[PDB]
Amino acid sequence: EAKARRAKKEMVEANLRLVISIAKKYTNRGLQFLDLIQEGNIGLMKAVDKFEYRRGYKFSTYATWWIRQAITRSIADQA
DNA sequence: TTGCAACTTAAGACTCACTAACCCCACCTTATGCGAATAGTGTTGCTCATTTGCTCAATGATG
């Protein structure tokens, strides 16, 4: 279990540049920036929880959906 | 001679600036879909308190 968590932390630590890169889009919707980066961090955590590698795709395309889920979810109910 | 307290200078952060009044305008938005859950609300059979109209009931005042 601890080994698996080390792997998952390691992957998240890889994909932070992805999450700020997508985080540039929806900035000025009446919320602050680091709220977006943290929500997106949650979203990529969930995307790590739901990714499989034997599918054969690049991780980012699958991850994108969970990130927009977290962002648009968060600004949606935090209007 | 060399460290060391002591004095001197400079750099930087914070606070702070009259009193009252009147008039005007400008103010802050984009996934879909699905099921599950929940809140709401709808219906109904059934209470509980509260005001009036009214009757008994007696007792001294009056015929």
Side-chain angles (χ1 to χ4, degrees):
Chain A
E1 182 176 1
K3 182 178 179 184
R5 289 186 289 109
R6 290 179 182 92
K8 293 175 72 173
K9 288 166 94 289
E10 187 171 0
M11 181 55 68
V12 169
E13 287 162 351
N15 296 316
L16 300 177
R17 271 83 182 272
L18 287 163
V19 73
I20 46 96
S21 68
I22 184 61
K24 292 191 298 297
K25 297 296 189 292
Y26 296 102
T27 62
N28 296 319
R29 299 291 182 91
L31 191 56
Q32 282 301 113
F33 184 77
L34 297 93
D35 296 333
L36 270 67
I37 77 170
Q38 291 285 328
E39 285 293 326
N41 290 319
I42 302 166
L44 76 99
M45 285 186 67
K46 182 65 69 176
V48 167
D49 300 329
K50 292 176 97 290
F51 181 72
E52 77 285 18
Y53 68 100
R54 306 170 70 248
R55 182 61 183 83
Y57 288 161
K58 186 173 178 180
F59 177 77
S60 302
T61 311
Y62 180 73
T64 306
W65 292 94
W66 295 105
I67 300 164
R68 290 177 177 175
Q69 169 65 44
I71 294 167
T72 310
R73 171 64 174 84
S74 180
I75 62 101
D77 287 333
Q78 273 60 239

